[PDB]
Design a protein around this ligand. Structure first.
Ligand code: RB
Ligand code: RB
Lengths: 248, 26, 10
């Protein structure tokens, strides 16, 4: 997060850290959607252009964290992947279309004040809140610069209109993506940055007071570049795949 | 139980920037 | 830059 602010304690309890066992480094963000399921970007696990192809035995899920680097004893919970699922049609070759994976944890995790899952939108929720001008919130331990937080950062950002998104890049934007960020004019900054991918884009419902994850941090070009925006996976468009792997 | 925070929503306490989100949903 | 995690968890 570039131009974000320090998260308050317990502000994002669904916020999960994706951590490399060896060498021990942060890979990406992710979110907790249940007690055994974690939602992240597929590009966090698999990206052939960069020889990246992480396995289940390769990583650790750390939930309940505030601090980037300390091991928060008695607060945070570290778990093991029982299995990883990438969307059969994730497009790494062209545009990172369908950048979404599900992780099944080796054991259910218990909820505390620091650990609590986020809701997944239902069709009418996505309809009323996934609108241009409406702000969503991203959190992450990623670069604060186009360098590292000591604590979880937040930034609130507006969703931008499809046309403006399409005209700011050369990449082919699909119906499974939405972009978010301020216009150079609005002259407000903030953006995800390296380290932040796979974390959640979330909105609070004005009807029932809940937090809904609407996007996943996917791709962008630079951090907090003018006229460029963040691309996020459209979680409701992929909802039916998500239910599929969870019941099956 | 989804989306209601143990420390905020459940104690009827607001975080310090949520109002920025709610005010935008017109 | 990370502090040592328990081996319990590896
Ligand atoms: Rb274009
Ligand atoms: Rb921007």
């Amino acid at each position: 997060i570039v131009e974000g602010s320090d998260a308050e304690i317990g502000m994002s309890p669904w916020q999960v850290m994706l951590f490399r066992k060896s060498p021990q480094e942060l890979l990406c963000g992710a979110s907790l959607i249940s007690d055994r399921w974690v939602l992240t970007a597929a590009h966090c696990l698999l990206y052939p252009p960069w020889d990246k192809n992480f396995t289940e035995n390769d990583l650790l899920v750390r939930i309940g964290k505030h601090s980037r680097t300390r091991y928060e004893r008695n607060i945070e919970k570290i778990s093991m992947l029982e299995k990883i699922y990438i969307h059969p049609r994730y497009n790494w070759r062209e545009n990172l279309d369908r950048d979404i994976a599900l992780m099944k944890l080796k054991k259910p995790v218990a909820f505390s004040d620091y650990i609590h899952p986020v809701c997944l939108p239902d069709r009418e929720t996505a309809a009323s809140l996934l609108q241009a001008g409406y702000k969503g919130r991203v959190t992450g331990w990623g670069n604060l610069k186009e360098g590292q937080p000591s604590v979880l950062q937040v930034v609130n950002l507006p969703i931008v209109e499809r046309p403006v998104c399409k005209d700011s890049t050369r990449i082919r934007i699909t119906d499974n993506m939405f972009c978010a960020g301020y216009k150079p004019d609005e002259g407000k900054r903030g953006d995800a940055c390296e380290g932040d991918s796979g974390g959640p884009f979330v909105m609070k419902s004005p009807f029932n007071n809940r937090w809904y994850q609407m996007g996943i941090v996917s791709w962008g070009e630079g951090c907090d570049r003018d006229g460029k925006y963040g691309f996020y996976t459209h979680v409701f468009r992929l909802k039916k795949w998500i239910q599929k792997v969870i019941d099956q | 139980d989804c989306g209601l925070r143990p420390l905020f929503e459940k104690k009827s306490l607001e975080d310090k920037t949520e109002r920025e989100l709610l005010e935008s949903y017109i | 830059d990370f502090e040592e995690i328990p081996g319990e968890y590896l």
